[PDB]
Structures are given as C-alpha cells and as structure tokens.
Amino acid sequence: IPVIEPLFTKVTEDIPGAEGPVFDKNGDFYIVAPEVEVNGKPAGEILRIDLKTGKKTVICKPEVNGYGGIPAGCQCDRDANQLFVADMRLGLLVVQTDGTFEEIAKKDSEGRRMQGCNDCAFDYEGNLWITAPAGEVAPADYTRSMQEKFGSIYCFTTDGQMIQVDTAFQFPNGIAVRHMNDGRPYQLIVAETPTKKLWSYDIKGPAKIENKKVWGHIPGTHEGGADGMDFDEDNNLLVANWGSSHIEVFGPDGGQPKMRIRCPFEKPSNLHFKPQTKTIFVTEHENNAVWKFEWQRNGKKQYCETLKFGIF
Ligand SMILES: [Ca+2]
Ligand SMILES: [Ca+2]
C-alpha cells in the first residue's frame, strides 16, 4: 500500500482528547475537548480556534444538572449556524455560536434511555446519523463499549425523531454518508474501533438502513483502530487509524486501504476539510493537538455547504 508523507503544520495545542474538528457556515473553526476533567469529573469543552493565531476560546462547557459532558464529535447545521455535538455523557447537543446549548434527547423514539454519542454525520437530506459507543447518558454511571458490544447507532431525523437504527457494536466511532452524484444518500459507513473494521449499510431512506456488511479493514494490531472519517470530493474515504500513526485512504468500493498517510504522531483521532480547499485539519491524542496538511483534492461538501434553496 503506497504511503505519502505530506507536511503537517501545527494549528493549536493542549486540547485534552482533541476531537470533532468542524467549520461552521461562516468559516469559523471549532474543536471539542471531551477529556477535560475537573476533580476527576467530566468537564468537556467546545472551543473556537482562531486559525491565524492558534488561540483557543472555550465557547461552551456543557453540563446538565451538574453532570459535565464529554463532547466528542460535531456537524454544522445548514439552515442555522449551529453545531450538532455528539456527547459521550449527554447524548446529542445543539450548540449555538454564542455558547448556549440544548440537550436534544434523554430517550429515543422507543422510550429507551439515550446512550452517550461520539460522532455524527449529516446526509444531504438533513438527517443526522450518530454513533453511540457509550452506555446510558447521565445521570447513569458512565460506561463505554470498548470491551463489550453495547454500542448503538442512531438517526436524528428532520421531523425530530431520535431513532436507534442498530445495536451491538464494540465502540462505534467515526461515521460518514456516501451520496450519489445527484445528492441522494445511499450508503452509511460506520467505524468500529477495536475490531479494526468499517461497516456499511444501504440507506433506503430517513432512519432506514439495511444490509450490514464488513466494508473495509483497518491495518494493524495496535490498541485502537478507526476513529474519525470524511469523504473527499471523489468519494475516497479518509479514516484516522488511532494508534497506527496513519490516516487510511479507502477507494469508493472499500476493502483494503489504497493509500496511507503518515502522520508525525501515533494517535490521529478525527479530521475535517476546510470548505473549498484541499486542507485537512487533524486532531490527535499523542500530543493532544490539532494540525493540518494538504490532501490531493478538495473534500466532499458537508451538509452545511449545501443550499436549502439551491437550484442545481
Ligand atoms: Ca471519535
Ligand atoms: Ca470531520
């Protein structure tokens, strides 16, 4: 497998568990620090990063009834400049740029208690596909599916339903949606970290997935595996292989990586393209920092880059 070694430029530092890199509708850059703790208790943060200086600003330190959150993944909304944040303790949050936030669900569409989430991905229809590797949200005692298969997948629909679409994953992590050239969502990719697998489903409609299949194989026997992911404009899937020092690049058909990207650190966690560029921002847990490097082409447009009232 060919390996490239692009130049990684430092963006910002000292962000505990640096995760969920995302750009909003105005081009502002955000990062979440899920692993910030105060007195051994969760005190996760959502930060805005000044790309010119690398200076950090904590806009939100989510907590519900005294229970601090562990914000781990993000997706920018299209119709409003707000961020949908996957939280390991609080579930799904909607965070405004002013720092205020709301907890979306304590229970799913079936009345079952919500599970802590890690990452999410918007399809072009506005439905949010979410990975939930943690156990029940606060006030329940914190648990995570790294050893046992109790991780779930949800789909938060346009009509406000939090639907559990699958279960029994050993730490479902990164998640991505593949679209047809006409914009129709048709395939969901889900990373299962410790098992070194990428799973796929056919998206038949909002909150309707079928035919679970082992889509790709993550290299290595190191502790860790696939974390965050995103598609480039040609539908190649870039996946952060936490613990391997590489970001794997899968072709449209999956299977084995067709290329690897060597990182100057062992724990790449998540990544995100800056709109209209080849620049990929990468968070990593060796130094707990954020970097950026140039990919071969532009990223696949995120839902927030599409237009509700577009014509073409
Ligand atoms: Ca993650
Ligand atoms: Ca991303």
- The answer to whether 227 and 173 are in contact (CB under 8 A) is yes
Name which of 178, 156, 151, 179 is nearest 166 in CA terms: 151
Task: Name the catalytic one among 179, 246, 272, 285.
Answer: 285
CATH of the domain at 19: 2.120.10.30
Antiparallel, parallel or unpaired: β 91-96 and 101-103: antiparallel
User: Near ion ligand 2, which residues have CB within 5 Å?
Assistant: 230, 272
Cα-to-centroid distance, 5 and ligand 1 (Å): 23
Task: Locate 3 and state its tokens.
Answer: 């390996």
Tally of domains within the chain: 1
Please report which ligand is nearest the Cα atom of 132. 1
Give the chain as a 3 state SS string: CCEECCCCEEEECCCCCCEEEEECCCCCEEEEECCCEECCEECCEEEEECCCCCCEEEEECCEECCEECCEEEEEECCCCCEEEEEECCCEEEEEECCCCEEECCCECCCCCECECCCEEEECCCCCEEEEECECECCCCCCCECCCCCCEEEEEECCCCCEEEEEEEECCEEEEEEEECCCCCEEEEEEEECCCCEEEEEEEEECCEEEEEEEEEECCCCCCCEEEEEEEECCCCEEEEEECCCEEEEECCCCECCCEEEECCCCCEEEEEECCCCCEEEEEECCCCEEEEEECCCCECCCHHHCCCCCCC
* Determination approach: X-ray
Cα-to-centroid distance, 245 and ligand 1 (Å): 16
- The answer to whether 201 and 188 are in contact (CB under 8 A) is yes
Long-range contacts of 166-169 (CB under 8 A, 24+ apart): 166/201, 166/209, 166/212, 169/131, 169/133, 169/145, 169/199
Q: Answer positive or negative: Cα dihedral of 220, 225, 228, 231.
A: positive
Name which of 44, 45, 53, 59 is nearest 11 in CA terms: 53
Cα-to-centroid distance, 128 and ligand 2 (Å): 13
Left, alpha or beta for 296 (phi > 0: left; psi -120 to 50: alpha)? alpha
φ/ψ of residue 215, rounded to 5: -85, -40
ω into 257 cis (within 30 of 0):
no
Cα-to-centroid distance, 74 and ligand 1 (Å): 10
Is residue 285 part of the annotated active site? The answer reads yes
* Residues, the chain: 312
Q: Answer positive or negative: Cα dihedral of 280, 225, 13, 78.
A: positive
Long-range contacts of 182-187 (CB under 8 A, 24+ apart): 183/124, 183/306, 184/124, 185/123, 185/124, 185/125, 185/127
Q: Kindly report the number of other CB atoms within 10 A of residue 43's CB atom.
A: 18
CA angle 103, 104, 110 (to 5 degrees): 130
Beta bridge partners of residue 171, listed in sequence order: none
Task: Locate 52 and state its tokens.
Answer: 């010119």
Exposure b/e, 243-277, CB count within 10 A at least 16 = b:
bbbbbbbbeeebeebebbbebebbbbbbbbbbbee
Written as one letter, the residue type at 121 is A
- The answer to whether 264 and 200 are in contact (CB under 8 A) is no
Task: Locate 82 and state its tokens.
Answer: 């707000």
Domain region containing 261: 1-312
Lateral strand order in the sheet of 151-156:
119-122, 128-132, 151-156, 162-169
